[PDB]
């Protein structure tokens, strides 16, 4: 049986299994029973991508078997083989969809099954910023548990997102691999069809970030081949179904690597028996590049350990919190004041503890020097300090400035981790991440209570005050140069951000100062200067140079952009906005929802459904994606009347932005704790009830001019 016949045989078996499980759903639930995946806006993504049709009931699921049949043409030509691979992918999705119909919870821990849309958008940024070099789809079984654990942890230590299908899930558990979405080790399921759950991640990436409409299958296949850096490692004996599923991965442009003897196809299907070189073979086959990090600490330092969890039973000592106040500060000084590679520790070390999880004050004073180092770069360094400290195994860092929290686990301590290794990590990452400006870096870790008390008020508090003052002193009128971030163009070619003092990047990780620091550090980076000349309308937020820049960067996809409006040529979003705001014409205002919120909205749509209406780099009036810091902005919907249009917000988001929103709404002379007027899901969620609440509460939206 040659390659073509193996793939055709596998697709027929996939079709046979899909027909059998659909018959069970019809007999048990009927053709009128609803068919859906948990928390998705694209129905069944593979069928929606291939045909544009949304499948909602069981009767339509049975009619989707004809899609599988039409994709299996048994002629030995490459196009038919790729179509047959897509037939297996469609059949696998139908099988997985029928699982949720038959069982309310078809997947138990540790398997996650289907991956919701908010999770995909959460990992959308890491993908664009390169935080995630690629996606390792590992399925099958390795010869032993340690071999699987070594390969999986090798991918994990390199920052790749690895997905597991089959017995490698159990082998990795025996190998003590830390699994989780935040640990970038996702077990999908023990059945081969569970590999469709990572396929739909790539498919929805084209739908979400690429802005490709459903039914444009070739554009979606082209997108996944160029944009999604996924590859398959198939271990253990491969059945015909596994090979046919691999042809589906090849159809999406994902190369398939295996330890089995197969009819190899160059750059697409490769055999690598040497398990010690499988990771390197896959990175070359998928053109994935990872920068090598060197750190003199006896612990594993990877980005995937940012989500590590340490139980209180096995915690060595904790700093910060309400136990003993701790602080962190990055300050710039003269060349002679800081000498390179001086990690001094003041006070007791971490090994002097002789008890249960101990309380000890902490202080991290970081002194960097350089010719191009100014006071404005300190916030960026201190912000990345949190990520630097959280990448160490056995170390969790929470908070910022003097409201920080550091915990060291016993696992890291038993490996020789001490307090000077904090300085080692900080020094290495400061000279590595910010080598353009940070010529020298002297880091001192303080555990003496008196020294921590006296240096916190002498060096840190005044700088916190000056940073807050500088942040409060920045408005769009004060500045004379905006910045444009095109980092997200790796997945949304038509999307260009314009970060202003009063409007940060919709991802929430790029601010005006962050953009200004990225431009200074990397003049060829995504952030570039955009002068605010050629003003057309200050109320709606229009500048001629901004339009010129957006046309140039987006290659003419977007010609006109307004920065302070939601209904006239709004700035595009891609997929990464923390919150999304949509107009509510019945309430004469706008509703808002964050990504973490997973309930309904007065518009009748969840966050995923709402967000599937304004992404991909397409100008969509009425729906705007933005960060949480843009909610309480004087330029938030300035053209449409400002903050008065906010009529419904989630309670968690309302509590997050209450103080800032009240302070900004005080300009409308609504001195009423304006956050109280806005409805929330704990008060009312349907349009009738929220409108009644607005009428009773005297909301400014009802008294304003019509928004549409």
């Amino acid at each position: 049986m040659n390659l073509f016949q193996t793939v055709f045989t596998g697709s027929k078996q996939a079709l046979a299994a899909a027909e059998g499980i659909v018959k069970q759903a019809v007999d048990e639930k009927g053709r009128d029973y609803k068919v859906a995946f948990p928390d998705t806006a694209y129905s069944l993504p593979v069928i929606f991508a291939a045909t544009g049709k949304k499948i909602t009931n069981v009767g339509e699921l049975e009619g989707a078997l004809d899609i599988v049949r039409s994709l299996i043409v048994e002629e030995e030509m490459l196009d038919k083989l790729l179509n047959s691979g897509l037939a297996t992918a469609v059949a696998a999705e139908i099988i997985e969809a029928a699982k949720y119909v038959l069982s309310d919870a078809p997947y138990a821990e540790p398997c996650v099954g289907f991956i919701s849309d908010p999770i995909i958008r959460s990992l959308g940024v890491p993908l664009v910023t390169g935080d995630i070099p690629g996606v390792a789809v590992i399925l099958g079984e390795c010869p032993d548990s340690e071999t699987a654990a070594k390969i999986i942890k090798d991918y994990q230590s390199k920052g790749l997102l690895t997905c597991l299908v089959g017995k490698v899930i159990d082998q990795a558990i025996e190998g003590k691999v830390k699994m989780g979405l935040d640990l970038r080790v996702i077990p999908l399921g023990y059945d081969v069809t569970s590999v469709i759950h990572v396929v739909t991640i790539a498919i929805r990436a084209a739908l979400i970030f690429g802005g490709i409409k459903g039914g444009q299958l070739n554009d979606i296949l082209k997108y996944t081949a160029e944009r999604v850096p996924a590859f398959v490692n198939a271990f253990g004996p491969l059945s015909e179904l596994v090979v046919s599923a691999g042809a589906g991965a090849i159809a999406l442009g994902f190369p398939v690597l295996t330890d089995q003897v197969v009819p190899e196809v160059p750059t697409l299907l490769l055999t690598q028996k040497d398990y010690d070189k499988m990771v390197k073979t896959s990175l070359e086959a998928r053109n994935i590049k990872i920068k090598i990090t060197e750190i003199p600490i006896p612990v594993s330092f990877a980005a995937a350990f940012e989500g590590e969890r340490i139980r209180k039973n096995d915690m060595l000592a904790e700093f910060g919190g309400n136990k003993t106040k701790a602080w962190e500060l990055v300050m710039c000084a003269d060349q002679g004041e800081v000498e390179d590679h001086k990690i001094e520790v003041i006070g007791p070390d971490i090994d002097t503890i002789d008890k249960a999880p101990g309380r000890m004050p902490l202080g991290m004073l970081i002194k960097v020097s350089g010719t191009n180092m100014q006071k404005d770069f300190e916030p960026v360094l201190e912000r990345r300090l949190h990520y630097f400290l959280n990448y160490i195994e056995g170390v969790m860092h929470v908070g910022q400035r003097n409201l920080t929290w550091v915990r060291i686990g016993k696992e890291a301590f038993e490996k020789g981790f001490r307090l000077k290794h904090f300085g080692e990590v900080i020094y290495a990452k400061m000279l590595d991440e910010f080598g353009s400006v940070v010529d020298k870096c002297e880091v001192t870790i303080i555990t003496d209570p008196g020294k921590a008390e006296e240096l916190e008020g002498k060096y840190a508090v005044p700088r916190y005050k000056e940073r807050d003052a500088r942040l409060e002193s920045l408005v769009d009128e004060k500045v004379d140069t905006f910045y444009s971030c095109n980092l997200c163009q790796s997945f949304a070619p038509a999307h260009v951000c314009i970060v202003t003092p009063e409007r940060l990047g919709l991802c929430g990780a790029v601010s005006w100062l962050d953009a200004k620091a990225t431009l200074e550090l990397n003049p060829t980076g995504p952030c570039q200067a955009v002068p605010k000349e050629g003003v057309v309308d200050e109320n709606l937020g229009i500048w001629e140079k901004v339009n010129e820049t957006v046309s140039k960067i987006s290659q003419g996809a977007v010609t006109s952009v307004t920065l302070y409006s939601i209904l006239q040529d709004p700035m595009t979003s891609c997929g990464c906005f923390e919150c999304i705001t949509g107009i509510m014409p019945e309430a004469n205002g706008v509703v808002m929802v964050n990504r973490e919120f997973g309930a309904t909205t007065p518009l009748g749509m969840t966050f995923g459904e709402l967000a599937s209406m304004t992404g991909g780099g397409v100008q969509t009036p009425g729906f705007m994606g933005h960060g949480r810091q843009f909610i309480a902005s004087k330029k938030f919907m300035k053209g449409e009347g400002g903050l008065g249009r906010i009529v419904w917000m989630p309670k968690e988001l309302k509590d997050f932005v209450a103080e800032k929103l009240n302070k900004t709404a005080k300009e409308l002379y609504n001195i009423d704790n304006f956050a109280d007027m806005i409805c929330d899901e704990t008060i009312a969620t349907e349009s009738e009830e929220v409108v009644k609440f607005l009428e009773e509460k005297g909301h400014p939206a009802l008294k304003m001019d019509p928004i549409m």
Binding site: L3, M77, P263, E264, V265, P266, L270, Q272, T281, E284
Partner: protein, 628 residues
């Protein structure tokens, strides 16, 4: 019917009609209905008791010649003599190359330009290379190659790419080759009156003779040419008659021997000759090549290709050819007569190829560069006799990419090799795409033009059909030049003509769907390639989904080529019927029984679309046999 599918050819045919000169098409028309006996191969003239003609229809008319020879005997002897003549042409070419290799020196006109290739060849000839002078090695290699032509004791030397299974099959069949000239002499002896009167034995002798062409003569000629003049690599060129320049001296190199054309190319950069071209009122020197010598200089230097066999006369019809320099083979003698109607100097250079009423300037191999310089100076001085009012150069030229030697193909295949897997510098990626079925097979398109077929029509149709069916095509000779003129030798052609699997392969490897592997002797390269693939897969060459096609062949060399390709285990399609239809036993041997002997056989198909269909079906049959 139309004379050609090429528009430049048609414009020049109109001009030739206006000028009152006759072409090969006109002479073909004048020949009218050709003799049926000779067309069927049932005419014999091997002794002066004849001429004898027997009926091409068994059971009717005269059955035997005067000596008693049957139609099958007459047909088999005629076929064998065609094979012997083709083998002689190729072997004489290779012999000249081997002698040139023997006369190489560090400070001479002929040097060694590819030392690595020479060392590999020396390994193949059991010549020591470590700690030795490169020219001592070259002379030893040339001695071994020359011994392949005329050794009377011992076994000949064959390339390592030839599978052991094929050698053993040849030995069991009785066709294992001897020295090349010895096999030619044996074939000529057995066709003498009153010798071999058994068709099966006659065909086997012809196969044995053709093997000395494919694996010894052509192979050694190609490899020694690579050693002396450089291994071809990917290179751009232009093709068709539009490459001629009105305002420059136009020197057209026609023939097969590469040493003369190499020396002419070198002489064209001589400062004195460039100054002389300027002084006669020309912008410069424009060298253009035709047929196989054009293929050689184009593969190695990017010299523009003016045209293939049936275009040679039309090159003169433009009125822009100042000098037409010819060595041997496929040089229409009518050129001499045609040259009287224009200013063109028609220069013969080889003692083997005197042509009446041409200007004879013997190419001196003792001083090749000076001899080439004086010949080129005659061509340049003829520019003063140009009549610009008679000049018409059609503005039809086409970009082409060529230079795909086996080494160049392996270098290209190295791109799609994962570094962590390997190995490098093998044909393994090609074997992988063939085994997986992404490529259905590989087909060699070779051969001449023939007035019996609309010129270049069969070549182009066969090539387009094959690449549309995900069959990668390698081309040589006049077929390669037809592909170049048409525009198939382009990377863009992959997305314009190829099927899905071949288009993907071309994109991944960055090659055209059609690979120009050189001249007619460079068909040995094809053998080499196939052999390597077979040796990588541990099978004989008859187990692979490969084929050869000669859509428009005319020459005895083409007959010998097809015979040794079939004998090597590669099915061959002939687009022009050979004169064998009069002998039913010979037809049955060539098209049916041959498969029992060597695992391949001839296919006679004059319809190119049907030929493509048959090739695809046969390749699928062999794939199903092989399990892929």
């Amino acid at each position: 019917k139309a004379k050609s599918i090429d528009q430049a050819t048609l414009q020049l045919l109109d001009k030739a009609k206006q000028d009152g000169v006759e072409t090969v098409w006109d002479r073909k028309a004048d020949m009218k209905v050709q003799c049926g006996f000779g067309s069927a191969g049932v005419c014999c003239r091997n002794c002066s008791m004849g001429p004898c003609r027997v009926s091409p229809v068994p059971g009717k008319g005269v059955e035997r010649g005067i000596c008693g020879a049957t139609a099958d005997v007459i047909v088999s002897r005629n076929f064998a003599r065609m094979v012997a003549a083709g083998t002689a042409a190729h072997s004489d070419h290779g012999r000249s190359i081997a002698l040139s290799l023997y006369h190489t020196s560090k400070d001479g006109d002929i040097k060694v330009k590819d030392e690595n290739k020479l060392k590999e060849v020396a390994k193949s000839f059991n010549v020591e290379t470590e700690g030795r002078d490169i020219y001592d090695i070259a002379h030893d290699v040339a001695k071994e190659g020359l011994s392949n032509y005329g050794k009377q004791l011992g076994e000949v030397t064959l390339p390592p790419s030839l599978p052991e299974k094929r050698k053993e099959l040849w030995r069991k069949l009785g066709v294992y080759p001897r020295a090349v000239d010895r096999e030619i002499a044996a074939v000529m002896h057995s066709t003498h009156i009153g010798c071999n009167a058994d068709a099966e034995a006659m065909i086997k002798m012809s196969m044995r003779c053709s093997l000395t062409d494919g694996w010894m003569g052509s192979f050694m000629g190609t490899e020694f040419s690579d050693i002396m003049f450089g291994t071809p690599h990917s290179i751009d060129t232009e093709a068709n008659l539009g490459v001629l320049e009105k305002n420059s001296v136009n020197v057209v190199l026609h023939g097969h021997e590469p040493l003369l054309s190499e020396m002419v190319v070198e002489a064209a950069s001589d400062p004195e000759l460039v100054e002389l071209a300027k002084s006669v009122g020309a912008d410069g020197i424009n060298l253009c090549g035709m047929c196989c010598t054009g293929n050689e200089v184009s593969m190695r230097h990017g010299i523009k290709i003016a045209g293939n066999f049936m275009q040679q006369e039309l090159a003169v019809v433009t009125g822009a050819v100042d000098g037409l320099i010819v060595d041997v083979q496929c040089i229409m003698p009518a050129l001499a007569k045609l040259s009287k109607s224009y200013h063109t100097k028609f220069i013969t250079t080889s003692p083997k190829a005197h042509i009446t009423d041409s200007i004879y300037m013997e190419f001196d191999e003792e001083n090749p560069l000076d001899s080439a310089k004086k010949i080129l100076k005659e061509a340049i001085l003829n520019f003063k006799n140009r009549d610009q009012s008679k000049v018409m150069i059609p503005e039809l030229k086409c970009k082409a990419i060529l230079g795909y030697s086996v080494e160049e193909i392996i270098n290209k295949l190295d791109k799609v090799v994962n570094t962590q897997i390997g190995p490098m510098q093998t044909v393994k990626p090609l074997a992988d795409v063939l085994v997986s079925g992404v490529l259905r097979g590989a087909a060699a398109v070779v051969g001449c033009n023939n007035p019996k077929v609309v010129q270049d029509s069969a070549h182009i149709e066969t090539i387009k059909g094959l690449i549309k069916n995900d069959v990668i095509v390698v081309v040589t000779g006049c077929a390669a030049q037809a592909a170049a003129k048409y525009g198939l030798l382009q990377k863009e052609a992959a997305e314009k003509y190829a099927g899905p699997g071949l288009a993907t392969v071309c994109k991944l490897v960055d090659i055209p769907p059609v690979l120009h592997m050189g001249s007619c002797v460079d068909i040995s390269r094809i053998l080499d390639l196939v052999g390597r693939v077979a040796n990588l897969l541990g099978v004989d060459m008859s187990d692979l989904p490969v084929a050869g096609v000669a859509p428009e062949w005319m020459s005895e060399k083409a007959v010998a080529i097809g015979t040794y390709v079939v004998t090597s285990g590669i099915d061959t399609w002939l687009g022009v019927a050979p004169p064998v239809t009069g002998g039913p036993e010979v037809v049955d041997i060539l098209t049916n029984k041959m498969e029992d002997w060597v695992g391949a056989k001839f296919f006679i198909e004059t319809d190119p679309h049907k030929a493509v269909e048959q090739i695809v079906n046969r390749m699928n049959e062999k794939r199903k046999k092989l399990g892929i």
